[PDB]
Symmetry: C2
Subunit: 485 residues, 2 copies
Amino acid sequence: KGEELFTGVVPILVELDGDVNGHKFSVSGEGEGDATYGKLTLKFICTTGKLPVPWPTLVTTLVQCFARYPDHMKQHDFFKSAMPEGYVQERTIFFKDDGNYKTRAEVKFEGDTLVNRIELKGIDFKEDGNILGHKLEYNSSGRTGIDPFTESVLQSQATELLQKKAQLVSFKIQGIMKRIFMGANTLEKFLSDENSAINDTLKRRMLSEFLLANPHVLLVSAIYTNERVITAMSMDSKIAYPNTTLIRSLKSITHSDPYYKEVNGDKIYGMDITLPLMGKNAIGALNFFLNIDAFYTDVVGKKKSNTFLMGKDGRLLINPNREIQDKILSAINPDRRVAKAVEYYNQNEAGTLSYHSLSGNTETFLAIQPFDFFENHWRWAIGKYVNKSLVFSSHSNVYITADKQKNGIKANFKIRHNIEDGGVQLADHYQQNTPIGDGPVLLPDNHYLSTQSKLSKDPNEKRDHMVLLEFVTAAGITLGMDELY
Amino acid sequence: SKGEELFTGVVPILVELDGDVNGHKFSVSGEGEGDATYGKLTLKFICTTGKLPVPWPTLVTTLVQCFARYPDHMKQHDFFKSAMPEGYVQERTIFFKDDGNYKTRAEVKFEGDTLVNRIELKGIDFKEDGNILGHKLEYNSSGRTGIDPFTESVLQSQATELLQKKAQLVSFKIQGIMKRIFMGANTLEKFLSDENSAINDTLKRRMLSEFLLANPHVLLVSAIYTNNNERVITAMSMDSKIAYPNTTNMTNQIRSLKSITHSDPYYKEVNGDKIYGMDITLPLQNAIGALNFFLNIDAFYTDVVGKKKSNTFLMGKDGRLLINPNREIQDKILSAINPDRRVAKAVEYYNQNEAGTLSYHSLSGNTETFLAIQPFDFFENNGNHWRWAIGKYVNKSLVFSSHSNVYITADKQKNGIKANFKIRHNIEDGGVQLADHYQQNTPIGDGPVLLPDNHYLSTQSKLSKDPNEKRDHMVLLEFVTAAGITLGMDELY
């Protein structure tokens, strides 16, 4: 019921009202979540001026409702269950040898927006100490609480997953293209030389069917060299038969370089694939225009995603950002490491690589999956990429446990903040979540939530601010008493 | 590594152990198979000298990491396979705390198609009344001694998701194949529907043959004309050749047809072979005739099961096995094959068109099986009729057993690898018997090998017995996988 509210991208708003040692301040946040992937993209601004505390101290306080719960564990999800009315989330954060935060928040829906209103009160802080003195670092470093084996598992998983998703897109593209070429061959067999057996009217019906069976094709023409051309074209839902006009040397399948075709007032990106009708080996040729733009949803999906389709020389055939379509990768991105992707492509070998992204000043991890769309001329490649600095950052964990007396959940965990020039500042978290409203909620079995966070800055934001990117995922030993926990 | 190429399929395993522990000489012979693709090992070990003087669990690490599953991105770090086929020497010293120690030297190499493991083991300084020589260790692991709950949470969740995902991926491929059949069938219907056109029967035969050529999962197709020039044009995909057989009161059932239909699955006799399939019959404002084709279900064997046998099945109405690795249970219902009533949860998933997992006891052996069911429509109803389901299953007791790990590190001097690890054997009335392992592997041949970056190998093992084996023996099932922080240490630490 609440899971249903987290099916697409959800707009996030967060308002924090804070007072630490008498220093009052306010933080406003905006962004979006996708629980399908556990992705959180957030920007926070301090509206009162300078923030009196380090930004890292307020991350756990500033939405576990966007945690990715594997389908087998979607019954242990209280955060989404409490939606749409919401949940109260109170914490006490003890900074060792310093003050403590007391937070009370309300995470609820206001229309399509998931809101997080927070009241925070801090006391007993040292004015010269790591918090009020701003001596904590912006992001985590060092091996303090990182299990190498655990991180090995998770990293290997991430890399395999990225590689697999690229493979799965390729297969889907190949499926679509296989059918086109299979049908094109059949057309070739009938249109070859069925003099009388096939009258032009019957030929046209075969051409229209080809288009109907393969919506990724815009038009198809049989060019006979009774020099003539029977052409069919797909206008919206409707097959029309335009009267084009005008081979010989052709003796093998060929395709044009991709280009834009003007149909109506739209420019459609595609390519012309011409197949000879020979006969006695050149009776004519069959040509069709492959609508590459018709693959947008097949490559990128219904929601924007980090997927691209790439051709000869690293040319972007499909991309979420339409502005870089038809542009070469190495000509758009200065980072010369991108050339590894064209190299993978040219060697018809799948593989990963790292490069700097123009969009976002982030290190990007990219999986390239080359594939032949017909059995380097007939070769494309899928690209799946992700924020490298996020995906291979350390995981912090919270052991979620049910509190029956309060129809809710509880959790205790330790955040370790890096101190300037050496050492760790402990922040001992105590949490209790209670639903808003007396409706049925899912009290879960014990399980873990695992978070990767990366802090950054908006180069164009003049005010005191934090950009927060996170992955949040749920894991548990729930169907496996076979290990004897 | 040209070695990895030797581990592409299932590989036969043989293991010979020659043992001496405090003067008690013994010999162990092992047989089985590995698939490095999945990290799967299936082994049976026999003691040929009589009773084994040591507990079987003490010998599982001695009695084949060449079969570890290495992710593509970590392949350059697979020393074990890179040393093949010439092989590697694997020496260990195993210190049993407050007791004796094993010294093993083994040679893991190829002898023909068989990966062999010849082991010489020498044990000294053991207490005759102690956990080893006194047989006071248990058969399998128990208790929370050295399992990180979080780590096991990750791995278990991964396993469950993976199993569910693989079922989904087979379903899509089946749907792909079926989508084209029905797309082509519709086109046939459009052309064969106008008998009053210039579509001569000869042109109809060509369209029918193309349909078969484009869709090799179809055995034959017939256009049955009823309401004028009573005739039947049939094409059949014979031995790589499209032939045109000549058939001549199912004429009123075609007259009765008012939507697409399929027969119940059955076996059709073509030549001397029974081909399992079903008839799909499509009508040509009434009923000019019908188009019928026979869907060869057996033609989906490789699409469902793969080139190597695997734990996949294709299931129809009432839990009927359409495709299965074991051909003997084809056409049989799941609930009528397996006594375990929990199998009915599959069938329930199927009827509700909802994916999900379940547990049941496998006829196979005495194994608890974990099964993911993925229902899917192979044609677009509000009823079943046009629904199948994929089943992916695995040994539940193995997949959700604890993982033991070894930190593999390179030894540059000896052109090989090294590792230290600790196994905790459960003591009968008691606690844990530590077994501190020290390992050093060196290649046999003087050829190039891959010295790896540091990484982990992770093993799940389950010990069992063959009820029909009268001799002292161990049945060992294992998963072995490789994991590492290789392309992301900087972003991390």
